[PDB]
Short mmCIF file of C-alpha atoms and ligand atoms in Angstrom, two decimals:
data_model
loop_
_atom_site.label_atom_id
_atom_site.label_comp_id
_atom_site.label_asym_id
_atom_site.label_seq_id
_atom_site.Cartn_x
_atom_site.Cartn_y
_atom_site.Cartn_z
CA UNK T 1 -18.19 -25.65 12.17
CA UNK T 2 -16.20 -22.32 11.06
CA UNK T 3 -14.56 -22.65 8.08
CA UNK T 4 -10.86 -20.22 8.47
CA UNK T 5 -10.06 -19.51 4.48
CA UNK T 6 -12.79 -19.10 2.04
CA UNK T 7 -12.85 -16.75 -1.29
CA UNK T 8 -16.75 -16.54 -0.87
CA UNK T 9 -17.16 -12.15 -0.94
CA UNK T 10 -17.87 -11.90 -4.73
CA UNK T 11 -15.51 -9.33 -7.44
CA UNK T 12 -12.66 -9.47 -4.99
CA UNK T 13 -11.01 -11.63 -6.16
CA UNK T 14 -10.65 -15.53 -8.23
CA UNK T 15 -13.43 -16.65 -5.44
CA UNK T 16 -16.49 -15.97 -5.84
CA UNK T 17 -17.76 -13.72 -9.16
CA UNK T 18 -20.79 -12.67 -8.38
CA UNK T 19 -23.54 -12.45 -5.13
CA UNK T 20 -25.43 -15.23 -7.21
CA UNK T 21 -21.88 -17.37 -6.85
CA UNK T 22 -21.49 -15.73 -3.02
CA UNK T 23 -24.89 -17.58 -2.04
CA UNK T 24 -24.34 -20.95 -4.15
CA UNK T 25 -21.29 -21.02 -2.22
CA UNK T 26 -23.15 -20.55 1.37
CA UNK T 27 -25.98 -23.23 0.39
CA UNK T 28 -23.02 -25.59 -0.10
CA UNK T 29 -20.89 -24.69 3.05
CA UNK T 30 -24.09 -24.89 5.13
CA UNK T 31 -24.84 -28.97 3.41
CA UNK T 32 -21.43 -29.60 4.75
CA UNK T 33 -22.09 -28.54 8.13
CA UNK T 34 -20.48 -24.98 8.28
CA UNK T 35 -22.12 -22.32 9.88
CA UNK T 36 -19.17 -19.53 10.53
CA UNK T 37 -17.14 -18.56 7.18
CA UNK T 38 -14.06 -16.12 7.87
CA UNK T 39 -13.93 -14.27 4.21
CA UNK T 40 -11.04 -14.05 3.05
CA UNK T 41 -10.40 -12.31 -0.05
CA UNK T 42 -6.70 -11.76 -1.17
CA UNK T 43 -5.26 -8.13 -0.07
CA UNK T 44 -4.61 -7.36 -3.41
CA UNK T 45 -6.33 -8.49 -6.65
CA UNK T 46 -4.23 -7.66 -9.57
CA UNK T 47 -4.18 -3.93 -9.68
CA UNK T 48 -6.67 -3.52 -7.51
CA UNK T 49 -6.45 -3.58 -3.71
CA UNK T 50 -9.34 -5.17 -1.22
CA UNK T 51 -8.61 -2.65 1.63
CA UNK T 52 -10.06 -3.59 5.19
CA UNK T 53 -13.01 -1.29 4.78
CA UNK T 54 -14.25 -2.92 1.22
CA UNK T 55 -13.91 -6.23 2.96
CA UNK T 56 -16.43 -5.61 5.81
CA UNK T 57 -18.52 -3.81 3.90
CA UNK T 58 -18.82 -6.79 1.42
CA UNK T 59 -19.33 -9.04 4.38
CA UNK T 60 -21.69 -7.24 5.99
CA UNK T 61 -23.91 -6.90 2.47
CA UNK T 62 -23.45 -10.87 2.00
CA UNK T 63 -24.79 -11.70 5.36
CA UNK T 64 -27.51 -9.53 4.46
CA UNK T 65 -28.01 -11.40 1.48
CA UNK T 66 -28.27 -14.57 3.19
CA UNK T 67 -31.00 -13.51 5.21
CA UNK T 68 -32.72 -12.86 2.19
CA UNK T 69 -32.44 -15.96 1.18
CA UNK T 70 -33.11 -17.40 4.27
CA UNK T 71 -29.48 -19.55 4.78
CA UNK T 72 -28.07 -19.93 8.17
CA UNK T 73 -24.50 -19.00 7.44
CA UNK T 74 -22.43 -16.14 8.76
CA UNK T 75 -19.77 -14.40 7.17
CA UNK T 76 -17.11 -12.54 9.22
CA UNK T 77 -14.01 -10.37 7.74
CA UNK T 78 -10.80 -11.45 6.89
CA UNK T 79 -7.94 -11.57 4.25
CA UNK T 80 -5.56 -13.87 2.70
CA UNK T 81 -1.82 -11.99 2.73
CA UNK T 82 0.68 -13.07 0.40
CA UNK T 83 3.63 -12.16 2.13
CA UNK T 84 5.60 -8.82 1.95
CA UNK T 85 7.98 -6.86 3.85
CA UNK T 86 5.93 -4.94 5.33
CA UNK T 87 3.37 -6.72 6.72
CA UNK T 88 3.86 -5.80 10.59
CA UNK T 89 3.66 -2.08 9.87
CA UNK T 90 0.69 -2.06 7.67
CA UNK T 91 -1.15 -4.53 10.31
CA UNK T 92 -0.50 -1.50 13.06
CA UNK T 93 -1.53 0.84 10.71
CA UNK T 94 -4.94 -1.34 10.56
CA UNK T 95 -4.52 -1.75 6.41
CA UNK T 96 -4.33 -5.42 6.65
CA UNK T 97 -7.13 -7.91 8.26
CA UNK T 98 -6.50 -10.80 10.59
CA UNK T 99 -8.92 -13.34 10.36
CA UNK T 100 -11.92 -11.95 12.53
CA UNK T 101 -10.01 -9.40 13.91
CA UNK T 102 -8.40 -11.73 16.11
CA UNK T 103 -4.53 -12.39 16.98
CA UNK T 104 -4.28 -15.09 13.93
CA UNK T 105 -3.35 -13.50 10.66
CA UNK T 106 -3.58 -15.60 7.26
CA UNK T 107 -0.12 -15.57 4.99
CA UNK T 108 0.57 -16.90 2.05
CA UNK T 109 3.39 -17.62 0.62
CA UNK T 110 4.27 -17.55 -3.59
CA UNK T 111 3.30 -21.15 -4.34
CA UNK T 112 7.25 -21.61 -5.45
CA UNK T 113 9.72 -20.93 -2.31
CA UNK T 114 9.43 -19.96 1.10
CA UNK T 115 10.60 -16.30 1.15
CA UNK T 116 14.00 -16.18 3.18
CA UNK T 117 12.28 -13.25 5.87
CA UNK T 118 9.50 -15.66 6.69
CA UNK T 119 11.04 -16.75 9.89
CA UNK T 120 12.13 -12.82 10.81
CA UNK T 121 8.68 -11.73 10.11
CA UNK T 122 6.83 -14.51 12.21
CA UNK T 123 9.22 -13.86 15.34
CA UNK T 124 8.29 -10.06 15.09
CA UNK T 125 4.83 -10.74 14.73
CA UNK T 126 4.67 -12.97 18.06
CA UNK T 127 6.39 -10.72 20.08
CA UNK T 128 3.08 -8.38 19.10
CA UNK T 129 1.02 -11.07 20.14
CA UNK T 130 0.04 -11.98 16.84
CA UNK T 131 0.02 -15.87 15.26
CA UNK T 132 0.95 -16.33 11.85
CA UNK T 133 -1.54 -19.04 9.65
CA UNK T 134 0.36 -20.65 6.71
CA UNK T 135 -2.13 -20.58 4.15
CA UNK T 136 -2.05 -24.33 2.08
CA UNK T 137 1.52 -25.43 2.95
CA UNK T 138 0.78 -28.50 1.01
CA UNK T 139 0.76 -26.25 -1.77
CA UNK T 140 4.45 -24.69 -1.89
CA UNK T 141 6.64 -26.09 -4.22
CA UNK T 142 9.37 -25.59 -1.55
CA UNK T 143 7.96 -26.66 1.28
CA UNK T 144 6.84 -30.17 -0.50
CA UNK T 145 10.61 -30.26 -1.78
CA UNK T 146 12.07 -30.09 1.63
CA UNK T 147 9.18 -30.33 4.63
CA UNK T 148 11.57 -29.51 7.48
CA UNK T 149 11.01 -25.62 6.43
CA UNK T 150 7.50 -25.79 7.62
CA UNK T 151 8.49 -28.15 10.56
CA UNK T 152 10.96 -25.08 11.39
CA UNK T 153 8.47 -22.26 11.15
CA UNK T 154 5.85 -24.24 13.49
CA UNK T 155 8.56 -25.09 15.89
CA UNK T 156 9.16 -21.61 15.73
CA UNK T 157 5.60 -20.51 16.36
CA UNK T 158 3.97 -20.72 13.83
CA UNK T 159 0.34 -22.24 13.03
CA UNK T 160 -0.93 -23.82 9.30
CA UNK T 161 -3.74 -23.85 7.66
CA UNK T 162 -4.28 -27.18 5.60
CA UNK T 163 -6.75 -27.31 2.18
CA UNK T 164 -9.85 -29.81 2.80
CA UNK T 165 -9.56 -30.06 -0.62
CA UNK T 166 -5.99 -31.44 -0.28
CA UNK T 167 -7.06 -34.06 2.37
CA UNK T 168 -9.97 -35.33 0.04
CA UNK T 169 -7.85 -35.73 -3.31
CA UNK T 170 -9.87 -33.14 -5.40
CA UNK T 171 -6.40 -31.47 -6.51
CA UNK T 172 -4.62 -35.48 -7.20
CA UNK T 173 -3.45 -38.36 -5.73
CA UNK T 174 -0.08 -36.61 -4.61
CA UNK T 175 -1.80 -33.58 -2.42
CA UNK T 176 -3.66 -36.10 -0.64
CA UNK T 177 -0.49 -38.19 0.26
CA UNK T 178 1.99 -35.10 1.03
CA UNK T 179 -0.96 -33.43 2.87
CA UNK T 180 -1.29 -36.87 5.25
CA UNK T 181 2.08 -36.71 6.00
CA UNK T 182 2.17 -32.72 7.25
CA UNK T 183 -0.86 -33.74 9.95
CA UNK T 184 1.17 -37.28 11.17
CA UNK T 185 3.89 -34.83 12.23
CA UNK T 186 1.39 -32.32 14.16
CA UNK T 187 2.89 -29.52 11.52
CA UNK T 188 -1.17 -28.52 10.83
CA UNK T 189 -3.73 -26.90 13.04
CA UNK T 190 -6.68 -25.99 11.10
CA UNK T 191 -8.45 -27.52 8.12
CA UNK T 192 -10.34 -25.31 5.74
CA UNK T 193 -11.71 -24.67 2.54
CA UNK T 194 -10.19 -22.26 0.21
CA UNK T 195 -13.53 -22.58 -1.58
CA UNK T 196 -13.46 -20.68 -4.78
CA UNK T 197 -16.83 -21.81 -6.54
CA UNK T 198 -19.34 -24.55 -6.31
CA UNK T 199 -17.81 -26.97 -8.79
CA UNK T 200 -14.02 -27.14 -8.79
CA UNK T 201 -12.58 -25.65 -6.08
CA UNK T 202 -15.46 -26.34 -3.44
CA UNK T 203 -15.73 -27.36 0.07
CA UNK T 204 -14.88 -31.30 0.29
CA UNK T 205 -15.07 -30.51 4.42
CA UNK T 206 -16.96 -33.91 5.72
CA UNK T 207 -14.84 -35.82 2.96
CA UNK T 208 -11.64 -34.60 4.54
CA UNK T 209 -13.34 -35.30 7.81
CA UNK T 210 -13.71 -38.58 7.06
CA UNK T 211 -9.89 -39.07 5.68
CA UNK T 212 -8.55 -37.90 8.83
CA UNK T 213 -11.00 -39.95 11.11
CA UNK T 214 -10.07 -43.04 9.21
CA UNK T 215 -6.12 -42.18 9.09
CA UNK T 216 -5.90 -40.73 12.64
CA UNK T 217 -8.58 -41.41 14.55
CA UNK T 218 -11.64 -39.55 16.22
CA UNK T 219 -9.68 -37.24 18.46
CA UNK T 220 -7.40 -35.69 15.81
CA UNK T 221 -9.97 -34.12 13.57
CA UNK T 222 -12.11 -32.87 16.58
CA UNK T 223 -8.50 -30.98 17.99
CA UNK T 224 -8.71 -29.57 14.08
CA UNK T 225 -12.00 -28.51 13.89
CA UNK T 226 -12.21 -26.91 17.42
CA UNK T 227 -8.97 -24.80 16.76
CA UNK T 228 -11.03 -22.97 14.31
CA UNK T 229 -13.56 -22.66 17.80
CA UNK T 230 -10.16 -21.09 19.72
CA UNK T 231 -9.30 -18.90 16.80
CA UNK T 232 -12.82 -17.14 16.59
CA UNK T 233 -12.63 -16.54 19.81
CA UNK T 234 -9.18 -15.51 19.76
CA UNK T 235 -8.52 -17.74 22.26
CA UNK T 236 -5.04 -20.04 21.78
CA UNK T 237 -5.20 -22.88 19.50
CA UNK T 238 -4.24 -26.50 21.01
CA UNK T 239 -0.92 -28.04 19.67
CA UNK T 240 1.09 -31.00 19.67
CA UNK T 241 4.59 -31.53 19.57
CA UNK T 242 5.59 -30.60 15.90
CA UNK T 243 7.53 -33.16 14.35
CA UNK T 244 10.46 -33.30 11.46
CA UNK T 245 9.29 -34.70 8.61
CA UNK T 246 11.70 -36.21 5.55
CA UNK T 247 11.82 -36.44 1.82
FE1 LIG Z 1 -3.70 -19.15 -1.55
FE1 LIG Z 2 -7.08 -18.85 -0.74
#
């Protein structure tokens, strides 16, 4: 399996804090079956910046590392983007990653609101070929508030990128039901881990497996999973019909 979203490259960012951290992190993505890890360190960490260069250099040393050490995990370059204006020009001018290097690009929005642009800067982006992932939409404030906002965006184009940890109610009770609720209406298209360290904010990928098998069936959570196939590849992800979804 390739896991999308993962803040495994160590002193990048809140992920991992050391190489000692990087590789605790790997043993535990490889137990839960992944073998593929798209880094992806936030574009900016505080004052400091994690500019495309750093980030494949960092990759590159960690897969080294794990050779060292003898895990079979590979690490590939990518970045999580909180949104900003001007993400299409700085993508052209090759100072942002996409996941891979591939047409799918990894945005986040500010946990509170869906920025009013969003939609202006997805349509842009798609007319460059380019498919914008909504990091953890489960996660906005705004978007749990009033759903349809997502269900707009994907209708729109759009592609999102659900936490495992979400789906396997590490972060509460009311994640887990919200999160349950954005698959039902076809709104997500990848599951991944957001894996910060070993202990809190960790992989939880078979257990959220195992919640969508039992909720949906077999065939949903092997569409998931092989999305993240499509998308390292950058091949086109499958869809269904995205749905409204209330409350
Ligand atoms: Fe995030
Ligand atoms: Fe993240």
């Amino acid at each position: 399996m390739i896991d999308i979203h993962c803040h495994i490259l160590p002193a990048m960012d809140d992920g991992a804090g050391d190489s000692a951290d990087s590789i605790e992190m790997a043993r535990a993505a490889v137990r839960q079956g992944i073998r593929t890890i798209i880094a992806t360190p936030h574009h900016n960490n505080g004052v400091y910046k994690n500019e495309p260069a750093a980030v494949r250099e960092a990759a590159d040393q960690l897969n080294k590392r794990l050779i060292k050490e003898d895990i079979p995990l590979h690490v590939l370059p990518g970045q999580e983007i909180r949104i900003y204006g001007e993400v299409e020009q700085d993508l052209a001018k090759r100072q942002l990653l996409s996941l891979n290097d591939t047409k799918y690009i990894l945005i986040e929005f500010p946990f509170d609101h869906v920025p009013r642009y969003a939609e202006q800067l997805f349509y842009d982006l798609q007319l460059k070929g380019y498919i914008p992932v909504i990091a953890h939409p489960e996660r906005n404030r705004e978007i749990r508030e009033n759903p349809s906002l997502l269900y707009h965006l994907v209708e729109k184009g759009a592609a999102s990128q659900i936490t495992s940890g979400s789906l396997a109610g590490i972060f509460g009770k009311q994640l887990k039901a919200f999160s349950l609720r954005l698959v039902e209406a076809n709104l997500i298209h990848f599951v991944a881990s957001d894996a910060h360290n070993v202990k809190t904010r960790n992989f939880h990928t078979q257990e959220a497996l195992y919640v969508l098998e039992k909720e949906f069936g077999s065939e949903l959570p092997y569409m998931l999973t092989e999305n993240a196939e499509l998308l390292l590849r950058n091949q086109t992800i499958f869809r269904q019909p995205p749905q409204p979804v209330k409350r």
